[model samples]
Target: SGAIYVGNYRVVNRHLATHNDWANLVWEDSSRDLLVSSTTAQGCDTIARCDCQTGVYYCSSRRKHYPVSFSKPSLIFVEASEYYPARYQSHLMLAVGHSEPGDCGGILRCQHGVVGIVSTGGNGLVGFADVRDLLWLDE
Candidate 1:
């Protein structure tokens, strides 16, 4: 669950018309790409690519059985890509999840030089501390 923010006006108005927040968790794969999950029935539970600069996301057409509800989060894997965007140069893979159990999700970046977890609201679950941990490609 995560907290809602006033700056999320666009997202709130687009998806969470009545609600205050939405959850779209992300994780890194062995290749260092990003995987995302929409933890709600109205969400899109497909692995997607994220623009570290604009923070915009693009998911594949693939879909899974992740139903939308306040439950345990889902684990995903990202495949690192040599592809680079013009906006941002230094790109790294990381995981992002909801700050709260059912609120909107956050981002996990691997640019700190250390493999640590960070949250949007200053509170974060670290060291792979969630029920839903990222899965390896072989897994």
Candidate 2:
């Protein structure tokens, strides 16, 4: 029920229970004066593999889910590498970082381009909801 906006564009909180630990900033597609644009990086700029000490970028609300005042989102830095789950192996595009998840929904970006969004965190590691080979937006 909370939202953050930049002019007419905004992102609202949402979670898809069907998907594991799935949460995201649900963009409103309704007609408006402004249009939403992609923040993703180009193909050539995307990171191909995980490397320890690889720098990544993301933003956080200082851990506050809902704030009364307008609090500027803090820029976060992390050293991350691609995550490989034993079950899924290379199927899922997940990244593991050596930092706090900084709350899910925050976009994860690398020096090259956008990596993914924060998904889950545990045992001193954070997970990213990768955006690779995503077949469809409505499936």
Candidate 3:
């Protein structure tokens, strides 16, 4: 018998970085730039267009044709709790009251820029990884 691996492959023009439990993928081509993400329900099945310079979410301009630079709020209206684990201190906890299962890998953006992507969460707390820490993975 032989082993078979489905739903796992690599593509061109993409780079991935992971540290501790943090992971991120940078995908880009001359024509487009995007953030690829994962979730508890659907691992690595999301993509979003963001500002190349600011790293913030992009939205359609008034014309609804071209995207405009970021001007969105930071977190959701719900309350949140942030923590740093003792063992994997590198990994952070950012629990939100509004999140449910499969919300991991969701983007956390602010007025300034993206803070990080969702990692894990429950009734009280959630886990996340800092985007800055994942940058070194590129090297």
Candidate 4:
């Protein structure tokens, strides 16, 4: 039987200041430069590429190809709420199956009820949020 073990998961990269960093949120000019994120979804599941430097979403410039960074990075813990518990800040990369507005919701038909945990189960997808920004802790 697989035991459910919940802990602070940090495999790649060593950022010792996590606990203090998120809380203190000391303004660091280079902090944004060190931040980065990506998505698991390919072909159809994608996210809005932002200018890592400016923290702008969906652009038509060369910087669009640059790495996705966040101006703020806050982590929250999931606690009691009767049913369950859950939670971030800064330049949130929030994901969704479809595009923001009338941007890229054409040919692909970015609808709902397609993917995710309870939707498919057993290690899969990011239902509503864009799969592209589906990150796990500090990666």
lDDT of model 4 at position 85: 29
lDDT scores of the candidates, listed in order: 0.23, 0.33, 0.31, 0.21
Q: What is candidate 1's lDDT per residue for 46-139, written digit by digit as tens? A: 2222222212211111211111112122332322223422222112322332233222232222221112111111133211212112222112
Q: Which candidate is the best by lDDT?
A: 2
- RMSD in angstroms, candidate 1? 17.3
- The Cα error of candidate 2 at residue 54, in Å, is 3.4
- Give per-residue CA lDDT, model 3, range 1-139, as digits (tens): 0010112311211112234113533332211111333323322322222333223321211211111232232232222323222222232434333443344444544444444444444564544333433332223
**By lDDT: ranked, best first:** 2, 3, 1, 4
Query: Would you give me the overall lDDT of model 2?
Result: 0.33
- Candidate 3: list runs displaced more than 4 Å: 1-89, 136-139
| Deviating ranges (above 4 Å) for candidate 4 | 1-45, 51-73, 77-79, 85-131, 135-139
What is the number of residue pairs that collide in model 1? 10
For candidate 4, lDDT tens digit of each residue in 17-95? 2454344342222211121223233223323232222222232222132122222222323223222222221222222
Worst lDDT run of 10 residues, candidate 3, spans 1-10
Inter-residue clash pairs, candidate 1: 1-100, 1-101, 1-102, 2-100, 2-103, 22-104, 29-78, 31-80, 40-68, 41-68
Best by TM-score: 2
TM-score, each model? 0.17, 0.35, 0.33, 0.18
Residue 33 lDDT (model 3): 12
